[PDB]
Ligand binder design. Structure first.
Ligand SMILES: *[C@@H]1O[C@H](CO)[C@@H](O[C@@H]2O[C@H](CO)[C@@H](O)[C@H](O)[C@H]2NC(C)=O)[C@H](O)[C@H]1NC(C)=O
Length: 260
């Protein structure tokens, strides 16, 4: 359930996608120059904002969701009602976040048309879904959906809320090889006493998935714990409340905007 320290390469990929998630709050700020910016993801009734990127130097298609940046996004945040994840039958007995399901159904067609449009050109490329805060959960619902059709799908999240019940957790765990940290393709990154991945309350049947990568201060790869199994530990053990400095800044990069 816990070991300290991760490879540099691994730490760098984490810091690397953590830079894309925060860059989304602006206009994909100083993101790696190896990647090409694709089409914008938008729906004005929910204010979901995302992007489709492609790295012709790395060989992957990346989908990035911007987190909460408006009151409309805030209305999706506070809704803790569970609802059948009717878009994915496969997921046996799953239910996901209420407000996040409102957002997901509002971009699914867009994301799936935009994603296949890129894959059908590069069947070679692997799919990656990343995001911070609500953007982070949006990426989970997305990855889950996508991964039922494509195979090589990775997922990196930062400050991810509890998006779903145990039925959904164990679904992601099977589909993303969480059984072990040498095969995991779902990286649930948490920071210090970030109190966001603690909501919504688990007393309500919510539950986390993926393999937890715990970051302590100072950042570092030597200061990142690999947390697994099911019990209280790491980020959940610090009991942060909600929306705190630990949340907004990841690996020393604030959502607010650029400095990287
Ligand atoms: C809070 O979230 C729930 C859950 O998603 C919302 O109700 C769902 O609405 C969708 C369509 O928008 C329906 O297809 C689902 O069947 C509903 N789920 C449930 C739990 O019945 C609900 O509208 C949201 N409440 C507010 C005030 O926005």
């Amino acid at each position: 359930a816990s070991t300290q320290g991760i490879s540099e390469d691994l730490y760098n990929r984490l810091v690397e996608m953590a830079t894309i998630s925060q860059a989304a709050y602006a206009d994909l700020c100083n993101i790696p120059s190896t990647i090409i910016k694709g089409e914008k993801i938008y729906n004005a009734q929910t204010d979901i904002n995302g992007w489709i990127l492609r790295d012709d130097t790395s060989k992957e298609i990346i989908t990035v969701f911007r987190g909460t940046g408006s009151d409309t996004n805030l209305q999706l945040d506070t809704n803790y009602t569970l609802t059948p994840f009717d878009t994915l039958p496969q997921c046996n007995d799953c239910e996901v976040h209420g407000g996040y399901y409102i957002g997901w159904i509002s971009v699914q067609d867009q994301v799936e048309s935009l994603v296949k449009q890129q894959a059908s050109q590069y069947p070679d490329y692997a799919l990656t879904v990343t995001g911070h805060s609500l953007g982070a959960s949006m990426a989970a619902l997305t990855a889950a959906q996508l991964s039922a059709t494509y195979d090589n799908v990775r997922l990196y999240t930062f400050g991810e809320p509890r998006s779903g019940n145990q039925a959904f957790a164990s679904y992601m765990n099977d589909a993303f090889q969480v059984s072990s940290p040498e095969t995991t393709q779902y990286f649930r990154v948490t920071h210090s006493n970030d109190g966001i991945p603690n909501l919504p309350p688990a007393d309500e049947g919510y539950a986390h998935g993926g393999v937890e990568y715990w970051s302590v201060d100072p950042y570092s790869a030597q200061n990142t714990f690999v947390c697994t199994g099911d019990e209280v530990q790491c980020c959940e053990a610090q009991g942060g409340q909600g929306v705190n400095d630990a949340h907004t800044t990841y690996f020393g990069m604030t959502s607010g905007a650029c400095t990287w």
